[PDB]
Scaffold this active site. Sequence first.
Site, short mmCIF file in Angstrom:
data_model
loop_
_atom_site.label_atom_id
_atom_site.label_comp_id
_atom_site.label_asym_id
_atom_site.label_seq_id
_atom_site.Cartn_x
_atom_site.Cartn_y
_atom_site.Cartn_z
N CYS A 50 0.81 -1.21 0.00
CA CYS A 50 0.00 0.00 0.00
C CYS A 50 0.85 1.27 0.00
O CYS A 50 0.31 2.34 -0.28
CB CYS A 50 -0.96 0.01 1.20
SG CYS A 50 -0.18 0.01 2.82
N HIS A 51 2.14 1.16 0.32
CA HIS A 51 3.04 2.31 0.23
C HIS A 51 4.40 1.97 -0.36
O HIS A 51 5.24 2.87 -0.45
CB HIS A 51 3.20 2.94 1.62
CG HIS A 51 1.93 3.49 2.17
ND1 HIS A 51 1.35 4.64 1.70
CD2 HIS A 51 1.12 3.03 3.15
CE1 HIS A 51 0.23 4.88 2.37
NE2 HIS A 51 0.07 3.91 3.25
N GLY A 52 4.65 0.73 -0.76
CA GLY A 52 5.89 0.38 -1.44
C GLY A 52 7.12 0.61 -0.59
O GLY A 52 8.02 1.36 -0.99
#
Lengths: 239, 54, 57, 370, 370, 74, 74, 146
Positions: free
Chosen positions: H110-112
């Site tokens: 979801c945020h890498g």
Amino acid sequence: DLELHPPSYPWSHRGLLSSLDHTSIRRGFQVYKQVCSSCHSMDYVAYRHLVGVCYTEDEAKALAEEVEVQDGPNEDGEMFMRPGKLSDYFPKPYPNPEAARAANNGALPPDLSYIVRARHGGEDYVFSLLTGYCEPPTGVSLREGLYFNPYFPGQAIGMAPPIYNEVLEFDDGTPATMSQVAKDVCTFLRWAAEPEHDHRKRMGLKMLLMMGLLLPLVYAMKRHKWSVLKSRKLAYRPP
Amino acid sequence: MFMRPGKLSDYFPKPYPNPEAARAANNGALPPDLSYIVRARHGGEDYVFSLLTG
Amino acid sequence: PTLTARLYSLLFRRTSTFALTIVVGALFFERAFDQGADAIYEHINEGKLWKHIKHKY
Amino acid sequence: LMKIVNNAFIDLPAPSNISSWWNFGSLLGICLILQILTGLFLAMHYTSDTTTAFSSVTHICRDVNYGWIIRYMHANGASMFFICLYMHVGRGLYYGSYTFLETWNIGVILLLTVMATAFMGYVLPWGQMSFWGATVITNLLSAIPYIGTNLVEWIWGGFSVDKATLTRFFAFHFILPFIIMAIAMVHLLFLHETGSNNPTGISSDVDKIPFHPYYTIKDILGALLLILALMLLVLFAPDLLGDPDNYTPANPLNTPPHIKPEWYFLFAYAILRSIPNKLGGVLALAFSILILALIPLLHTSKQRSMMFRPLSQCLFWALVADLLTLTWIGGQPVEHPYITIGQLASVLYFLLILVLMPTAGTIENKLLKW
Amino acid sequence: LMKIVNNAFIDLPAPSNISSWWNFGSLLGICLILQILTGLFLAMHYTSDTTTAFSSVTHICRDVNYGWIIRYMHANGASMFFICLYMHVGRGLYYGSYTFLETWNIGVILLLTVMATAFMGYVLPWGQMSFWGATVITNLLSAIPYIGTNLVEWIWGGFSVDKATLTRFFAFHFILPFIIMAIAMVHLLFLHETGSNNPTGISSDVDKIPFHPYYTIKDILGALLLILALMLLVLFAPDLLGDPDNYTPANPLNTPPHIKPEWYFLFAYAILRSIPNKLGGVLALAFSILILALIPLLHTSKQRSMMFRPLSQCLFWALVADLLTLTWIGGQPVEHPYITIGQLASVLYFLLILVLMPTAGTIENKLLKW
Amino acid sequence: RQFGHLTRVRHVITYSLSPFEQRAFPHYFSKGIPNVLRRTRACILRVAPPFVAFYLVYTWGTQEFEKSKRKNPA
Amino acid sequence: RQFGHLTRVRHVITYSLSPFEQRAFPHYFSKGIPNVLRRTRACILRVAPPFVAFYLVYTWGTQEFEKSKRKNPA
Amino acid sequence: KGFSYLVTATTTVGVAYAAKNVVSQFVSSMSASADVLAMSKIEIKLEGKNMAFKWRGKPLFVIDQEAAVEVSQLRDPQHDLERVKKPEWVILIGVCTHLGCVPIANYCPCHGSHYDASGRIRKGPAPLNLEVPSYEFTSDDMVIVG
Ligand code: HEC
Ligand code: HEC
Ligand code: HEM
Ligand code: HEM
Ligand code: HEM
Ligand code: HEM
Ligand SMILES: Cc1nc(CO)c(-c2ccc(Oc3cccc(OC(F)(F)F)c3)cc2)c(O)c1Cl
Ligand SMILES: Cc1nc(CO)c(-c2ccc(Oc3cccc(OC(F)(F)F)c3)cc2)c(O)c1Cl
């Protein structure tokens, strides 16, 4: 044709503050395992409920490591067996009721979780059930598998006699007679249908020594206010 | 327990008894159900059509 | 003065104190009443409870 | 500023000659809150599905930290509820409160609300009497012509009780006590235009007094005895009233020998059981309750109370017996010694109300020349 | 006789200069009843257990006779609810109704009741956003020191969301709208001591009029447009607002790439998301709502309305933008172009309220010499 | 509270007619639509420009977002 | 409704005392218990006899029920 | 006035006692049941795979080159063997430190946020290395995570 009322036996717990002889719960559990647990599907209990009552953590956990339990989807996409743990309920004997009827003369063992509270008299019934097997009377005939016992309704039961003197042997080594078994088991079953008996009486007791102590004081505080009007004289003084 | 021919009241014969066997019968990956996939995927039909035909 | 009158003018007169008194007494009362019944309950059921069979196992 | 409405509950004028009977009229405010309070936390763990429900009860009775209590404070609490009613309802008869025509009729609709609520409250856990107790009571509406089979199928969501019929109650059941919580406020509103109704029957306007010091503590004292006589059941005898069978899982292919719903219907269940006919006994049942609406058109004496009517006293407590009989006679099976009593006692119930209690005042007016 | 209370709703004095804005103040009476009415029949089939819940939704959407509607009249109905609020709440700002200090504060507690209700209402069906949407919002309370882990575990019934945490809501959720149904009556009671508050701000006592013919039909007309703009969603676009993911079953071992709760939090969710710190953003959130209680201590102009304050008009609708921004900016993921906007917009929200809206009246008083 | 003791009025006259004696929608098109405009001109200036700017930050916010995903020459 | 316009009283006098100036439970045993009896004698006659008869129909109802299950000489 | 009011207090004393307990009775119902606790501490687990298994309703994610990474360079200075007890048995709570998601092994999606084989951060909106639970090894084929 008739029912039969068991008597009002004494117990270590029949009193209004009398708890359970936890020792008597101990040997009773051995009976469920050696004898009953081949056909009685007690599902609403686990070994972890035995801690702090009859066994310890390790001793009980030993019994889950004893028996195998079906658990887990394998990454291969299958299911397997493992040694039980505490969180697992009692190993059910049979997967369903029908196989229990087929593995008997069509009849089904009822669970023992709440049988005591689900049967009029409970312990006295159950004790006097096992200890009421007798030779049939005159004129009575009974099919195969069935047996005679008056307390059961209809006086015709598909109950093989499960208990007999020294059917097994206990740990501490008490006399494993047909009675002493029947006490510790019936003592056990009440605990099954009441894991709160020990604590029920504690708040069972703490209540009175508050309410019996309060209830007068309130009954004074009532009478403290009303006493204005419990003591009032009137009059009528016209011209 | 046994097997019988299905009737109307029976749901679709499930392929596999659980997800894991579907991952093992594939390269670790799991087919999602198609019951509500259309409304559960942005665009729905246009996605799914253009998925196969892409 | 009796204890009662000495008790009145110290605590039961000022309502701010009268509430402070009760939680104090209750806070200690919780510490006695439990010990009492837990022992009486222990006493009446001597030889039955887990703590009485806690050493064997 | 809306606090000034509690002139109703603080500075209210009320009599001074007041018994501890009227505490019962107040305890329901506690029982209604006490039951919801318990039942709410209770229903954080209940499940409205068959396969898990009975387990979802035992999920409480075993594993929850002091969850086992809440079943019994709720259940037996629901019985101490009625024990106040059938002293609270018999009251106005014996003290002539039904004359408040705008109020007594409300006193019906609360009752029928409950006697269709508490019913729903017994069936949730599938105790093998839940199911059949649901079947026996609900099937009676089939007695009706041309709609009976349709409604009962409609409420059976089909053709008999099943998973759907559970869940249709758990929502109908978790809601109505609020409808009682509201209608109860109405039940007090019509009162507040006239105030209470003394044991004598006389307008005691000359001797009305406050409410915050006096009847408050009295109500607390009344409440204190309630909790006492509710803790005893849960702590010392929860198995007493609730039939033992309710711990058995439910199975439509096995009935118990004896069936009875919970003890409190039995004054009314027995009435139906007396009549061998199906329908013609039903309309006695509904009339066994709605008759209370028919009473105020049968107040004969130009007095009000029964404190000052010794003849009607002899007939009033007589009715209490017949109830205490019909409470028990229904609780026992159908055999010849008892059926002869139900054919009498059920008739006595209708008879004492609709013939003789008027007849007393018709006389007692004449013994004293009006 | 209690009908005379409906002097409040029949013969009430109210102004004549009244817009269709105040219909929105009335529709909630319909939405609140309409939602419960739907949701009740809806919950005759829902199940408060994991394994069956999502099926127990589809049990409705497929098999029930017109059960599929009731999910969407309820769900999207819950959104037309808010659309009235955030026109109803912005109203009193723009017409100066928050001065009714006894009432505006009630207007908060209704809101917080809902924004903790509607949350519970999204998580019941386990839509794979239910779970994580339950996790993201609920986990924030862990930010607190020395109690955060304890409460959240306490409300997680353990250590994370599971079967128990479902059922702890379905009862907390099926109850509160009644608490809203009651408190709403309070919200009107404090009003009835003063009546409404015209767009001008002037006491229009000289020109108050009835309510049974005039605003009744107007409210119906208001209601008619509601049902219209509610039937369109359910009939023609139910998938519009509700994120599509909510039809996927829930699995704690697979998150979606993008997460957002339902659209209506987003003005507030974004505010937290702006702050990279955990706790210090939370207290902005709760303050992003409770600030409405802080407004009446910031009414500067000795006028009331904003109809007669063109400068504040320029700042009011400006706030509507920042909301419509923060409504959307939270709805999009965390990347550099947007984060620069949240750090501004969220500050603009607090800024327009607490600095400039007072500052206008501080000026506008002086442009006109008081 | 109700009609009867609200406040004071002196020397004011009211002329009002039945509905039956009059059309429901008189001059709905004629006088209304000029009144819509006059209603509109007096609000439009201090209503739009925020929402106008929003259209630009909904504009630049996406364009500048799109670019950032496209690679760089490197 | 409240105190102030209920009804009329003329030429009546009330004498009432604090609680602090008096015991709470005076003559609780002395005067009460005779008053319990007098209270009791005035109710007992028209309260019991139904319940008395109930004890007999709870009596005969079970005895006559018990016999019917016992066999007959046949 | 002392004796009478003394009754009023001692009443109120007992009221609090009965109230302090009964309230906590319900509040313990909202708490975790007994069944959940038995599944809390126990997790009897058993190279080259992304082992992620549910536990406490949360995930359970389970050296040649891992030690090569510089700890001073990391956003959170923390060595591998500080985190683990055995080198070749990585354990951590699979909670992406940012906003509570499920990373993927061989990684916060979801945020890498890039993570090691050990779970330590290399590139992150993720501030910290991933949470490690307290645990215990009974034997070399079993684990007690808790
Ligand atoms: C042979 C397998 C087996 C054994 C071993 C066994 N049970 Fe049974 N149990 C049954 C079956 C089969 C029934 C069915 C009785 C019936 O249908 O009425 C039953 C019935 C019962 C009942 C039901 C009583 C009732 O009213 O129906 C109880 C209680 C019970 N057993 C307790 C015990 C106890 C105690 C023991 C050990 C002393 C025991 N069982 C050992 C199989 C067994
Ligand atoms: C080889 C067995 C198999 C076949 C045959 C099959 N599927 Fe798949 N399906 C899978 C697997 C395995 C996945 C996993 C995809 C993934 O993990 O992303 C999948 C994924 C999907 C998805 C999910 C799309 C997404 O976003 O992940 C859809 C939709 C789908 N298939 C539709 C179809 C359709 C349409 C057909 C027939 C044209 C079809 N499937 C035939 C096994 C199959
Ligand atoms: C006057 C109102 C009510 C009555 C008469 C009533 C009746 C009953 C009764 C008699 C039981 C007994 C079940 C048992 O003992 O095992 C019961 C159980 C139950 N009550 Fe109700 N109830 C009422 C209101 C409520 C309320 C207000 C709630 C929730 C707030 C509720 C929820 C439940 C649930 C979930 C059960 C299942 C637990 C059980 O079966 O023990 N009920 N109800
Ligand atoms: C939840 C249910 C109920 C609640 C909360 C409730 C509450 C009350 C209260 C607080 C009073 C005042 C106390 C009193 O007058 O003794 C009262 C009075 C009364 N109630 Fe109930 N009640 C309930 C059920 C009923 C029922 C079932 C009846 C059936 C007839 C009834 C009939 C009456 C009547 C007639 C009075 C008259 C008061 C008087 O005579 O002074 N109520 N009620
Ligand atoms: C202001 C009050 C309420 C709000 C804001 C609210 C919110 C929601 C929302 C947003 C959904 C969406 C689920 C979906 O679309 O799939 C939902 C579903 C649901 N509502 Fe509520 N609700 C409210 C009151 C109620 C009431 C009053 C009831 C019952 C009378 C209820 C029972 C349910 C149930 C059982 C579901 C599950 C159905 C589903 O998930 O589709 N809710 N609620
Ligand atoms: C279910 C929720 C609500 C209901 C049923 C409700 C109901 C009403 C109604 C019927 C009115 C009269 C119509 C009108 O004055 O326009 C009103 C007025 C008002 N409401 Fe709401 N309302 C709700 C929520 C809120 C909220 C969230 C606020 C937030 C501040 C609020 C604040 C106000 C205020 C300040 C008024 C003043 C009336 C005036 O200025 O004349 N209400 N409410
Ligand atoms: C004569 C008399 N009058 C009244 C009211 O006029 C009352 C009386 C006083 C207060 C009451 O308030 C209550 C208290 C608890 C629950 C309650 O229910 C509910 F649910 F709130 F509607 C009402 C309800 C009734 C009373 O106890 C007596 Cl004895
Ligand atoms: C000025 C003004 N005033 C009032 C009341 O003073 C109202 C008004 C009129 C009637 C109302 O009654 C209702 C009707 C439906 C639901 C409702 O919710 C409920 F019942 F409280 F849940 C209240 C509530 C408010 C109004 O619509 C306007 Cl415009």
